[PDB]
From a paper:
Pin1 is the only known PPIase specific to pSer/Thr-Pro motifs, which is critical as phosphorylation increases the isomerization energy barrier. Pin1-catalyzed cis–trans isomerization can profoundly impact protein structure and function, as confirmed by cis-specific and trans-specific antibodies. Pin1 activates at least 43 oncoproteins, inactivates over 20 tumor suppressors, and downregulates global microRNAs, acting as the “master” post-phosphorylation regulator of oncogenic signaling networks. Pin1 is hyperactivated in most human cancers and correlates with poor clinical outcome, whereas humans with genetic polymorphisms that reduce PIN1 expression have a lower risk for multiple cancers.
In this manuscript, we report the surprising findings that ATO inhibits and induces Pin1 degradation and suppresses cancer cell growth via noncovalently binding to the Pin1 active site, as corraborated by nuclear magnetic resonance (NMR) and co-crystal structure. To explore our unexpected noncovalent binding mode of ATO to Pin1, we co-crystallized excess ATO with the Pin1 PPIase domain and refined the structure to 1.6 Å resolution with excellent statistics. We noted well-defined novel electron density in the prolyl binding pocket of the Pin1 active site that was trigonal in shape with significant Fo-Fc values at 4σ. Although anomalous signal at 1.0438 Å was weak, isomorphous Fo-Fo maps calculated from ATO-soaked and Apo data sets showed clear density for what appeared to be ATO with central arsenic density peak >6σ. The electron density was nicely situated within the Pin1 catalytic active site positioned within van der Waals or hydrogen bonding distances of Leu122, Met130, Gln131, Thr152, Ser154, and His157. This model of ATO binding was consistent with the degree of change in chemical shift for all backbone amides in Pin1 revealed by NMR analysis. Again, neither Cys57 nor C113 were close to the ATO-binding pocket. Notably, ATO titration did not affect the cross-peaks for Cys57 or Cys113, further supporting that Pin1 binding of ATO is not Cys-mediated. The Pin1-ATO co-crystal structure predicted that an M130V mutation would disrupt ATO binding, whereas an M130I mutant would bind to ATO like the WT protein. Thus, the M130V, but not M130I, mutation in Pin1 disrupts Pin1 binding to ATO, as predicted.
Numbering used by the authors: 49 to 163
The structure:
């Protein structure tokens, strides 16, 4: 009750060979396994938690989503606009919180709720 109509999120996507589209601006063919993507995701999370790296800086360098060009920013979205697992994870975050690994048809994500 009272939920905001929209949230704004940045994310870092690591695709794998069973992503809906196993290709990105980084690689014409993404051949890593889902487990390898999860290992990379957990490595990125650790780098962010330790303060060695900034979330948006990692997303701009390493996210397999075209939103890497926007430093991970997807913009604001309402319910029904993102894939259900991503939507649910996003709306479950408090503003400024970062998720753990989120599994979608696109790959594995880290999500940072920015608004």
């Amino acid at each position: 009750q009272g939920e905001p109509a929209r949230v704004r999120c940045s994310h870092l996507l690591v695709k794998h060979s069973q992503s809906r589209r196993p290709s990105s601006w980084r690689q014409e063919q993404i051949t890593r396994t889902q487990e390898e993507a999860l290992e990379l995701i957990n490595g990125y999370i650790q780098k962010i938690k330790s303060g060695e790296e900034d979330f948006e800086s990692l997303a701009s360098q390493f996210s397999d989503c075209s939103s890497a060009k926007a430093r991970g920013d997807l913009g604001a979205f309402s319910r029904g606009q993102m894939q259900k697992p991503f939507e649910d994870a996003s709306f479950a975050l408090r503003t400024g919180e970062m998720s753990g690994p989120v599994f979608t048809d696109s790959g594995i994500h880290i999500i940072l709720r920015t608004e």
